[PDB]
Design an enzyme around this catalytic site. Structure first.
Site, PDB file in Angstrom:
ATOM      1  N   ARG A   1     -11.146  -8.301  -0.121  1.00 22.21           N
ATOM      2  CA  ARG A   1     -11.803  -7.456   0.863  1.00 22.21           C
ATOM      3  C   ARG A   1     -12.073  -6.094   0.270  1.00 22.21           C
ATOM      4  NH1 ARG A   1      -6.776  -5.390   4.698  1.00 22.21           N
ATOM      5  NH2 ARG A   1      -5.364  -4.861   2.958  1.00 22.21           N
TER       6      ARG A   1
ATOM      7  N   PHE B   1      -6.232  -8.494  14.939  1.00 21.97           N
ATOM      8  CA  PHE B   1      -7.653  -8.774  14.907  1.00 21.97           C
ATOM      9  C   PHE B   1      -7.852 -10.250  14.697  1.00 21.97           C
ATOM     10  CE2 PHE B   1      -7.748  -4.430  12.889  1.00 21.97           C
ATOM     11  CZ  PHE B   1      -8.131  -3.794  14.075  1.00 21.97           C
TER      12      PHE B   1
ATOM     13  N   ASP C   1      -4.335   4.093  25.823  1.00 22.14           N
ATOM     14  CA  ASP C   1      -5.104   2.864  25.935  1.00 22.14           C
ATOM     15  C   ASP C   1      -4.951   2.298  27.328  1.00 22.14           C
ATOM     16  OD1 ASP C   1      -2.982   0.481  25.852  1.00 22.14           O
ATOM     17  OD2 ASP C   1      -2.342   1.925  24.326  1.00 22.14           O
TER      18      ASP C   1
ATOM     19  N   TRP D   1       4.945   0.304  25.285  1.00 18.61           N
ATOM     20  CA  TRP D   1       4.659  -1.092  25.607  1.00 18.61           C
ATOM     21  C   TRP D   1       5.965  -1.866  25.911  1.00 18.61           C
ATOM     22  CZ3 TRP D   1       0.705  -3.490  27.264  1.00 18.61           C
ATOM     23  CH2 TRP D   1       0.445  -4.847  26.998  1.00 18.61           C
TER      24      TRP D   1
ATOM     25  N   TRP E   1      -5.536  -9.616  22.210  1.00 18.70           N
ATOM     26  CA  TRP E   1      -4.328  -8.952  21.708  1.00 18.70           C
ATOM     27  C   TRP E   1      -3.038  -9.779  21.804  1.00 18.70           C
ATOM     28  CZ3 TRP E   1      -5.843  -4.694  19.219  1.00 18.70           C
ATOM     29  CH2 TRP E   1      -7.021  -4.059  19.642  1.00 18.70           C
TER      30      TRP E   1
ATOM     31  N   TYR F   1      -2.377 -17.090  26.046  1.00 21.04           N
ATOM     32  CA  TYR F   1      -2.094 -15.680  26.324  1.00 21.04           C
ATOM     33  C   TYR F   1      -3.095 -15.184  27.361  1.00 21.04           C
ATOM     34  CZ  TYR F   1      -1.553 -10.619  25.688  1.00 21.04           C
ATOM     35  OH  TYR F   1      -1.319  -9.284  25.921  1.00 21.04           O
TER      36      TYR F   1
ATOM     37  N   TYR G   1      -9.539   1.398  24.147  1.00 20.96           N
ATOM     38  CA  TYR G   1      -9.538   2.821  23.905  1.00 20.96           C
ATOM     39  C   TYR G   1     -10.739   3.592  24.468  1.00 20.96           C
ATOM     40  CZ  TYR G   1      -5.700   1.797  20.680  1.00 20.96           C
ATOM     41  OH  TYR G   1      -4.528   1.400  20.083  1.00 20.96           O
TER      42      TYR G   1
ATOM     43  N   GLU H   1       0.834  -1.199   0.000  1.00 21.90           N
ATOM     44  CA  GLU H   1       0.000   0.000   0.000  1.00 21.90           C
ATOM     45  C   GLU H   1       0.875   1.258   0.000  1.00 21.90           C
ATOM     46  OE1 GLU H   1      -2.865  -0.665   3.245  1.00 21.90           O
ATOM     47  OE2 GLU H   1      -3.250  -2.525   2.166  1.00 21.90           O
TER      48      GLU H   1
ATOM     49  N   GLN I   1      -0.995   2.610  10.673  1.00 24.15           N
ATOM     50  CA  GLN I   1      -0.840   2.766   9.243  1.00 24.15           C
ATOM     51  C   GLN I   1      -2.041   3.128   8.400  1.00 24.15           C
ATOM     52  OE1 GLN I   1      -1.958   0.466   6.816  1.00 24.15           O
ATOM     53  NE2 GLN I   1      -0.761   1.060   5.024  1.00 24.15           N
TER      54      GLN I   1
ATOM     55  N   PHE J   1      -5.710 -10.271  11.149  1.00 24.77           N
ATOM     56  CA  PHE J   1      -4.457  -9.525  11.167  1.00 24.77           C
ATOM     57  C   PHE J   1      -3.569  -9.888  12.355  1.00 24.77           C
ATOM     58  CE2 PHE J   1      -1.928  -5.644  11.731  1.00 24.77           C
ATOM     59  CZ  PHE J   1      -1.483  -5.470  10.419  1.00 24.77           C
TER      60      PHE J   1
ATOM     61  N   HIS K   1      -4.828  -7.401  32.983  1.00 24.11           N
ATOM     62  CA  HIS K   1      -3.693  -6.511  33.146  1.00 24.11           C
ATOM     63  C   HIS K   1      -4.056  -5.350  34.050  1.00 24.11           C
ATOM     64  CE1 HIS K   1      -1.926  -8.063  29.062  1.00 24.11           C
ATOM     65  NE2 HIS K   1      -1.660  -8.874  30.069  1.00 24.11           N
TER      66      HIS K   1
ATOM     67  N   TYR L   1       5.552  -9.223  17.907  1.00 23.10           N
ATOM     68  CA  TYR L   1       6.212  -8.278  18.796  1.00 23.10           C
ATOM     69  C   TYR L   1       7.591  -8.875  18.992  1.00 23.10           C
ATOM     70  CZ  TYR L   1       1.712  -5.998  19.989  1.00 23.10           C
ATOM     71  OH  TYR L   1       0.513  -5.323  19.915  1.00 23.10           O
TER      72      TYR L   1
ATOM     73  N   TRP M   1      -9.547   3.023  16.030  1.00 18.59           N
ATOM     74  CA  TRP M   1      -8.883   2.774  14.756  1.00 18.59           C
ATOM     75  C   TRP M   1      -9.808   2.890  13.542  1.00 18.59           C
ATOM     76  CZ3 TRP M   1      -9.555  -0.906  18.578  1.00 18.59           C
ATOM     77  CH2 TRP M   1     -10.530  -1.899  18.301  1.00 18.59           C
TER      78      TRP M   1
ATOM     79  N   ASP N   1      -4.489  -0.923  28.322  1.00 14.35           N
ATOM     80  CA  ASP N   1      -3.393  -1.896  28.417  1.00 14.35           C
ATOM     81  C   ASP N   1      -2.064  -1.232  28.713  1.00 14.35           C
ATOM     82  OD1 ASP N   1      -2.830  -4.593  28.505  1.00 14.35           O
ATOM     83  OD2 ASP N   1      -3.484  -4.994  26.447  1.00 14.35           O
ATOM     84  N   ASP N   2      -1.665  -0.277  27.872  1.00 19.02           N
ATOM     85  CA  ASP N   2      -0.401   0.444  28.077  1.00 19.02           C
ATOM     86  C   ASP N   2      -0.432   1.205  29.411  1.00 19.02           C
ATOM     87  OD1 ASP N   2       1.692   0.457  25.799  1.00 19.02           O
ATOM     88  OD2 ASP N   2      -0.176   0.624  24.688  1.00 19.02           O
TER      89      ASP N   2
ATOM     90  N   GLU O   1      -2.448  -7.681  -3.382  1.00 14.88           N
ATOM     91  CA  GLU O   1      -1.740  -6.419  -3.251  1.00 14.88           C
ATOM     92  C   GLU O   1      -0.241  -6.551  -3.542  1.00 14.88           C
ATOM     93  OE1 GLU O   1      -2.856  -4.348   0.321  1.00 14.88           O
ATOM     94  OE2 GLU O   1      -4.988  -4.844  -0.004  1.00 14.88           O
TER      95      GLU O   1
ATOM     96  N   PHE P   1       0.672   3.604  23.093  1.00 12.67           N
ATOM     97  CA  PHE P   1       1.526   2.557  22.562  1.00 12.67           C
ATOM     98  C   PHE P   1       2.772   3.203  21.972  1.00 12.67           C
ATOM     99  CE2 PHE P   1       1.865  -0.878  19.119  1.00 12.67           C
ATOM    100  CZ  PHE P   1       2.162  -1.897  19.998  1.00 12.67           C
TER     101      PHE P   1
HETATM  102  C1  LIG Z   1      -1.323  -5.253  23.598  1.00 10.05           C
HETATM  103  C2  LIG Z   1      -1.272  -3.956  23.950  1.00 10.05           C
HETATM  104  C3  LIG Z   1      -1.078  -2.861  22.926  1.00 10.05           C
HETATM  105  N1  LIG Z   1      -2.353  -2.347  22.380  1.00 10.05           N
HETATM  106  C4  LIG Z   1      -2.278  -0.889  22.178  1.00 10.05           C
HETATM  107  C5  LIG Z   1      -2.656  -3.026  21.100  1.00 10.05           C
HETATM  108  C6  LIG Z   1      -1.657  -2.734  19.977  1.00 10.05           C
HETATM  109  C7  LIG Z   1      -2.392  -2.942  18.663  1.00 10.05           C
HETATM  110  C8  LIG Z   1      -2.249  -1.677  17.820  1.00 10.05           C
HETATM  111  C9  LIG Z   1      -1.477  -2.003  16.521  1.00 10.05           C
HETATM  112  C10 LIG Z   1      -2.471  -2.383  15.414  1.00 10.05           C
HETATM  113  O1  LIG Z   1      -3.201  -1.226  14.990  1.00 10.05           O
HETATM  114  C11 LIG Z   1      -3.996  -1.393  13.855  1.00 10.05           C
HETATM  115  C12 LIG Z   1      -5.324  -0.898  13.875  1.00 10.05           C
HETATM  116  C13 LIG Z   1      -6.171  -1.041  12.748  1.00 10.05           C
HETATM  117  C14 LIG Z   1      -5.698  -1.685  11.576  1.00 10.05           C
HETATM  118  C15 LIG Z   1      -6.494  -1.870  10.404  1.00 10.05           C
HETATM  119  C16 LIG Z   1      -7.890  -1.428  10.237  1.00 10.05           C
HETATM  120  C17 LIG Z   1      -8.896  -2.407  10.106  1.00 10.05           C
HETATM  121  C18 LIG Z   1     -10.234  -2.018   9.915  1.00 10.05           C
HETATM  122  C19 LIG Z   1     -10.584  -0.650   9.853  1.00 10.05           C
HETATM  123 BR1  LIG Z   1     -12.348  -0.173   9.568  1.00 10.05          BR
HETATM  124  C20 LIG Z   1      -9.583   0.346   9.993  1.00 10.05           C
HETATM  125  C21 LIG Z   1      -8.230  -0.042  10.185  1.00 10.05           C
HETATM  126  N2  LIG Z   1      -5.959  -2.512   9.291  1.00 10.05           N
HETATM  127  C22 LIG Z   1      -4.673  -2.993   9.252  1.00 10.05           C
HETATM  128  C23 LIG Z   1      -3.831  -2.843  10.383  1.00 10.05           C
HETATM  129  C24 LIG Z   1      -4.336  -2.192  11.550  1.00 10.05           C
HETATM  130  C25 LIG Z   1      -3.505  -2.039  12.685  1.00 10.05           C
END
Ligand SMILES: C=CCN(C)CCCCCCOc1ccc2c(-c3ccc(Br)cc3)nccc2c1
Ligand SMILES: C=CCN(C)CCCCCCOc1ccc2c(-c3ccc(Br)cc3)nccc2c1
Ligand SMILES: CCCCCCCCOCCOCCOCCOCCO
Ligand SMILES: CCCCCCCCOCCOCCOCCOCCO
EC number: 5.4.99.17
Lengths: 619, 619
Positions: A118, A592, A365, A303, A480, A486, A411, A36, A253, A596, A442, A600, A160, A367-368, A84, A356
């Protein structure tokens, strides 16, 4: 025995610390990030031939023998990702004949082509003009008008998703096309007979939304849309207000890229936000020793630093170690003191959380915040005034965030709406931020470090939350982190911390479940497939991190003597590297469920140290 | 004769050119810039002890023997300016006893103290807590609700006043106070018996506004103001949308500073806009060789570059000289291609103007656009395609900006409302941007360079405009240049260029007026007092620039042979320095008649060169 293991891990971790005093390992995901980025560069007309090269090397390096790419190492081929990656490589210069291109093209076609991808993937293609905008689910800028209380208002979406949506509503509002040179057109993505197997919304396509979307695409057609210019400026203003200090949007991103595109759309490239937006990108990129370059879906300095400290303590360094102090200090300058989007549901809550990434004030957040507050609580810094005050601010912020059901989300508070999950656009990942077991655990262990317990109403609700959420077999889900090992590892570790009794039935039923999965090699592992097929709960190749998790459940539950426990400790002790580290070619982190995954790169080192320090602790 | 003068002027001008190819002389004003900078630094809690030193050094350097400071060199003492200077020095460290402080405190007291100062000065004091906010005219954030057509909506105010107002409405909305340490409190500014001689609005205080202000100050008192939170966000959004690339706001000192304060007010210091706004400041600052530091009210690179080119041509260098080419190219990259605030009154006008400073896309001005377009039209650049196109865009934008009466304003079309001139707040400078003779003249001479003339309706209306505006004695006012010599010089120069006949009566009546004011030393000069007392029209010490202006009117009107003409040339030739420059210790540039003067440090070199080249031209 393990003594030397731990001693080596400590000196290793201490070596990985940066000068300013924090830890920061790269965050790994999949190749859609760099694919991308390549397209983004084309849209913005800023293609660096040298950079494309490093990206080509990387993309190829990540492709597997069968010509596909996956969401996680050792995973099934992913259609979206591979599509992609294909388009990216073709643009950079590789012809469709090349072996790599061929195997990929085959996978793609054997799947029904582009029509099975998608929304995001078809939308990117839509942007460069390789797919009709008419077939892409609309998200109108008018979405900006729905007030605080109303179906589908932007605060019903998770943090997000929210930003992404605002950003995109400007994009889809204009439906722009940035043509690819002829050499790179990818019509072949259609050349297939296999029937298109379309993916639907994460919750079900109620006929209303299909209608509603059809309406919107029709309303797009009209010659005039009253109040649209305003809906747009609403979106734009919404974005200008929240741009992060590093130039990003949310430290992630997706919206970052879409906002840059929207800004470009609105002829705003010579504006401060765009400039800073663009140059900020470099901080997220990484130079790979083999000549490649990757882009991080996000960054995890806070983190990393938080856990690093917690482990180095459980291990054995003194709460005033000059090295941990630098960390503790750094962490204090990170506390967020201004209100963020979260305040929309908690106007009278005093800000005091953390994020984060390095600088992202509007999106702290739980967690952090919990990990950082807890980690601080374990140190003795010069300014005992500030440590005291900061904790206090953070402590309260957490409490104030506790959702309805007694659990904590990441969040927001009660971002539990179900409505967003059904619209056409939402076919990838999560889209709302409901409370989860791991975050709650946590939070719980955070409080516990202070000395709070079962008595205080707060905890009680949380525990009741956790108990209603335990799975039949005794395991706890991993939102997560991958996965049952976990969650379970966390929960049990927490409950032990808040004073509960490790002897209770459900605690044992969990503790047992752990032991029942210890792999032959004396350690534990759980493959990412466990989000798709339940046969993999607790199953997978043994990794250093997941082993440490299981070990923590065991140590918390009193079974430190247990054979499984010792056996586990053996694994970590045998598999350790000569320098102190541990390898881990598998992702043990979750973005997710099902869609996804993340790697780490510090987990492999930190958790084993932490688990070992806790083993030595119980002896 | 003058040949050597001219030759030395050229090689000197050419030496002052920067590498990238433009000219950029510092813009001089008065010490309120640096004094306010000092207070701003206090507000933002970012005081650099070293910087304060270089500032104290400058402030003193500029104070006259009587202990006061003025709006222009060799001018009457200024209450406002001296008050701020005082407070600044006191804050930096000097005690009220010091010789300089004493003299100043005297002047300030002999004037009625702080109660006689302009709104801006009492407001700055209001900000640091040395003056009641209740006595400061209010400008409510609700101003943001008034739509396009309505009394006092923000687009009824001139570009500079507009941004300042929006910015301040957030500040006055919150009426914050950043207390000065005890050492610097300045109660003595009140210690006087002389009755306060209050300055009123630029147009008179209609009792309505006093009522309106009094109401607004009462409304401030209430416990709740519905929709105010929105009004504020309206201002902030208006502000975040328009920030300049260099981080400023409009490329001028006022709104820039107020916007930074407002962002501070809104707890947004770690926001991209604030950071960029802050770091941008440095570009405007200047290191003075005697150890002091000054801050420019604004910067004039485009303007400087444009005139530099026009002079070096009239002078003699080839329309394809390699140095003038670098310039021509640079100028092409400066053209603004997006819409700015001006588009509010001209939505179907294709953007193509330029700005005074480096990067300020939302505020191009007719004067700079006309000079740049004209200058480009005298060059031959490699890419004749672009020169051709750029001129066409600039040309049409100017035409599209011609106001109703036939003249041109600087930033907007028909920004002729009279309403803003009466509100309490507006007691300093201009506040609207109506058409002026000098800009119109410049636009006219621009078209003339292309060959358009008296027959084209556009020019006809402009000439009719200029004719209805001629002063009884035959002179023309000087809005942006000091003063009647500046305006007259331009008009005659222009009218000659659009084909009008230099023999007509009114042209002669003006030409004559010029000869009438030649000083004994064979040159012309006009002191800034001419804006206050008419006995100074055309009178003042001779300056190189004003001499050149008079000379141009003479040359354009055919009287190049005239004794006055020869005599004038003698002056410029005798007074030239050995290296080629010319000194000029007087300001010849105007900010706002009566209230704010500027010293364009390149005028002293460029105009004499241009004037001489035009003398040689007519022989
Ligand atoms: C464990 C503790 C730390 N917390 C802090 C969690 C860390 C996770 C944050 C990193 C991932 O953030 C994202 C968030 C959204 C993402 C999306 C996405 C998916 C659907 C929609 Br609608 C919008 C964005 N697509 C692709 C990648 C992504 C990474
Ligand atoms: C001659 C060609 C170039 N054009 C381009 C004119 C250059 C003038 C722009 C530089 C001056 O800018 C300003 C504009 C406003 C100024 C104000 C001011 C006064 C009243 C309000 Br209400 C707001 C601001 N106060 C103090 C200083 C200022 C300098
Ligand atoms: C801009 C007006 C001042 C508003 C006071 C701050 C209260 C904001 O409400 C919190 C909820 O709104 C979501 C996000 O706030 C973050 C960014 O907006 C920044 C400017 O306040
Ligand atoms: C923001 C969506 C509107 C897109 C149309 C562009 C028209 C802009 O109006 C020009 C006049 O308004 C004042 C300033 O414009 C500059 C900043 O606004 C930027 C985004 O357009």
């Amino acid at each position: 025995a393990y003594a030397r293991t731990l001693d080596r891990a400590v000196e290793y971790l201490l070596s990985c610390q940066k000068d300013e005093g924090y830890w920061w390992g790269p965050l790994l995901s999949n190749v859609t990030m760099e694919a991308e980025y390549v397209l983004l560069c084309h849209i913005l007309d800023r293609v660096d031939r040298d950079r494309m090269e490093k990206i080509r090397r990387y993309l190829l390096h990540e492709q597997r023998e069968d010509g596909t790419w996956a969401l996680y190492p050792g995973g099934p081929p992913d259609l979206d990702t591979t599509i992609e990656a294909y388009v990216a490589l073709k643009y950079i210069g590789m012809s469709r004949d090349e072996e790599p291109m061929q195997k990929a093209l085959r996978f793609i076609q054997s799947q029904g082509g582009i029509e099975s991808s998608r929304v995001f993937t078809r939308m990117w293609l839509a942007l460069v003009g390789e797919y009709p905008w008419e077939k892409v689910p609309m998200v109108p800028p008018e979405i900006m008008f729905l007030g605080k209380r109303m179906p589908l208002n932007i605060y019903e979406f998770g943090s997000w998703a929210r930003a992404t949506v605002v950003a995109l509503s400007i994009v889809m509002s204009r439906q722009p096309v940035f043509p690819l040179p002829e050499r790179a057109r990818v019509p072949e993505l259609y050349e297939t007979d296999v029937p298109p197997r379309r993916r639907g919304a994460k919750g079900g396509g109620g006929w209303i939304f299909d209608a509603l979307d059809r309406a919107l695409h029709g309303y797009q057609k009209l010659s005039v849309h009253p109040f649209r210019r305003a809906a747009e400026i609403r979106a734009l203003d919404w974005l200008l207000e929240r741009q992060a200090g590093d130039g990003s949007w949310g430290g992630i991103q997706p919206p970052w890229f879409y906002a840059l595109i929207a800004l470009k759309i609105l002829d705003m490239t010579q504006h401060p936000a765009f400039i800073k937006g663009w140059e900020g990108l470099e901080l997220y990129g990484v130079e790979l020793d083999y000549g490649g370059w990757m882009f991080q879906a996000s960054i995890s300095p806070v983190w990393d630093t938080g856990l690093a400290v917690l482990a180095l303590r459980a291990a054995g360094l003194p709460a005033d170690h000059d090295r941990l102090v630098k960390a503790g200090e750094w962490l204090l300058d990170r506390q967020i003191t201004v209100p963020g989007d979260w305040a929309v549901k908690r106007p009278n809550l005093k800000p005091g959380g953390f994020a984060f990434q390095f600088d992202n004030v509007y999106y702290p957040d739980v967690d952090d915040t919990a990990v950082v507050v807890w980690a601080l609580n374990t140190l003795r810094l010069p300014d005992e005034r500030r440590r005291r005050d900061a904790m206090t601010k953070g402590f309260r912020w957490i409490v104030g965030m506790q959702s309805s059901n007694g659990g904590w989300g990441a969040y927001d508070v009660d971002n539990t709406s179900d409505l967003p999950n059904h619209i056409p656009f939402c076919d990838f990942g999560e889209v709302t931020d409901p409370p989860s077991e791991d975050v709650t655990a946590h939070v719980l262990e955070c409080f516990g470090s202070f000395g709070y317990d079962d008595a205080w109403k707060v905890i009680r609700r949380a525990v009741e939350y956790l108990k209603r959420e335990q799975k039949p077999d005794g395991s706890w889900f991993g939102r997560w982190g991958v996965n049952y090992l976990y969650g379970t590892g966390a929960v049990v570790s927490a409950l032990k911390a808040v004073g509960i009794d490790t002897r209770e039935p459900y605690i044992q039923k969990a503790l047992d479940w752990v032991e029942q999965h210890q792999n032959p090699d004396g350690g534990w592992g759980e493959d990412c497939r466990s989000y798709e097929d339940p046969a993999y709960a607790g199953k997978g190749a043994s990794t250093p991190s997941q082993t440490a998790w299981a070990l923590m459940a065991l140590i918390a539950g009193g079974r430190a003597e247990s054979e499984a426990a010792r056996r586990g400790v053996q694994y970590l002790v045998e598999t350790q590297r000569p320098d102190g580290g541990w390898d881990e070619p598998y992702y043990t982190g979750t973005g997710f469920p099902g869609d996804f995954y993340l790697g780490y790169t510090m987990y492999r080192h930190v958790f084993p140290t932490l688990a070992l320090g806790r083993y030595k602790q119980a002896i």
